[PDB]
Design a protein around this nucleic acid. Structure first.
Length: 99
DNA sequence: CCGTAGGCACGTCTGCTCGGCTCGAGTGTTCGATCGCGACTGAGGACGAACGCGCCCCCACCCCCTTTTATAGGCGCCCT
């Protein structure tokens, strides 16, 4: 082996889960066709059932603003002053070897 | 007088904030290890002293210088 496998609940392992969540959130904004871009909490929780919503609230507070709507299905609208990172910048965040 | 709309209350979702727990990093202290120095001991070589060996000298002992005297066989020399 040439690449190090982390231990359970290590600092490297916990950083990887956070960054992979940050990668997946960003690509959901790139998939959204609405102007301004918007995503749902339900789509992240369906892909990440082992995360609490509060841990997802940490990754969404810096890049998105919560707009509540009169239905049990609400949107995270991308901040107008937040520049969404480009594709190759997302590529540098998490490599296939780290996964 | 009746119907409908609005207001309030409660439920639920989430967004923020506070408290508690745990993990990691650092620094100080204490213990063990290793290194250096000195001392002891063993081995080898060199020097000094004592003993033993070798050489030389000295001492001791025995025979040779003569005389005599009886007596006799053999060998060699000297003058008649």
């Amino acid at each position: 082996p040439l690449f190090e496998v982390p231990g359970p609940n290590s600092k490297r392992a916990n950083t990887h889960i956070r960054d992979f969540l940050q990668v997946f959130i960003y690509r959901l904004f790139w998939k959204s066709k609405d102007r301004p871009r918007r995503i749902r909490m339900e789509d992240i929780k369906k892909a990440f059932p082992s995360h609490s919503e509060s841990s997802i609230r940490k990754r969404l507070k810096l890049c998105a603003d919560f707009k509540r709507t009169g239905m049990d299905s609400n949107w995270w609208v991308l901040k107008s002053d937040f520049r969404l990172p480009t594709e190759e910048e997302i590529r540098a965040m998490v490599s296939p070897e780290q996964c």
